């Protein structure tokens, strides 16, 4: 599995779904389909949290990484599970949408990098040891 691909496809899907553009994301399949379906379902179930986050972020170029780090720490404070990983992807999608809304499209490239590195370094061992994306697909696909 390729975490950069997973992030790129997911962000492209979310942005395209809501009418936003991301130049660098213009373009195993089972993981991408499962992740985007899970995230759509999460956003429907927690739509109030989704709207609240969308309206409160108030991003700027110098604060975006801190907003990202602050939410991700809180999201995982009580431990990682697959639903919190889906929530992390959905949050990354909100950060990207809000970046364009604030006329800061270049931040989408940064956020995709931060998500990828989070998967590659912080979440990597938990994901591997709890069965990888294959287990996520068996559970929720
Ligand atoms: C600063 C903040 C921290 C403040 C708080 C919040 C918001 N909070 C974040 C944590 N949150 C969680 C966490 C874990 C779970 C969970 O059950 N965990 S679980 O048992 O592992 C699991 C259970 C089911 C599925 N799948 C169902 C399938 C149904 C058929 O279709 C395929 C999927 C999965 N799964 O991984 O797919 C995994 C969960 O409940 C669900 C319920 N339905 C779900 N559907 C998909 C995922 C999911 C999770 C919800 C609640 C909302 C913040 C916030 C704000 C905006 C954005 Cl944008 C983001 C975050 C920021």
Author numbering: 9 to 35, 90 to 203
The authors write:
BCL-2 is the founding member of the pro-survival class of proteins that includes BCL-XL, BCL-W, A1/BFL-1 and MCL-1. They exert their pro-survival function by binding and restraining related members of a family of pro-apoptotic proteins—the sensors of cellular stress (the BH3-only proteins) and the effectors of apoptosis (BAX and BAK). Four or more hydrophobic amino acids on successive helical turns within the BH3 motif engage complementary pockets (P1 through P4) in this surface groove of pro-survival proteins. Venetoclax competes with pro-apoptotic BH3 motifs for BCL-2 binding, releasing pro-apoptotic proteins and allowing apoptosis in cells primed for death.
We have now crystallised and determined the structure of venetoclax bound to BCL-2 at high resolution. We obtained crystals of BCL-2 in complex with venetoclax that diffracted to high resolution (1.62 Å) in the space group P212121 with one molecule in the asymmetric unit. The electron density for the drug was well defined and the binding pose was in general agreement with the published structures of ABT-263 and compound 1, with the 4-chlorophenyl (CP) bound in the BCL-2 P2 pocket, the piperazine bridging the P2 and P4 pockets over residue F104 and the azaindole substitution bound in the BCL-2 P4 pocket. It was possible to model two distinct conformations with the 4–4-dimethylcyclohex-1-ene (4DM) ring flipping at the 4 and 5 positions above the BCL-2 P2 pocket and the benzamide (BA) acyl oxygen adopting two conformations above the BCL-2 P4 pocket. Notably, the orientation of the moiety inserted into the P2 pocket is subtly different in venetoclax compared to ABT-263 and compound 1 structures. The structure reveals subtle differences between the binding of the drug relative to the published analogues, which would not have been predicted based on the previous structures. Venetoclax selectively inhibits BCL-2, thereby promoting apoptosis in cells refractory to conventional apoptotic cues.
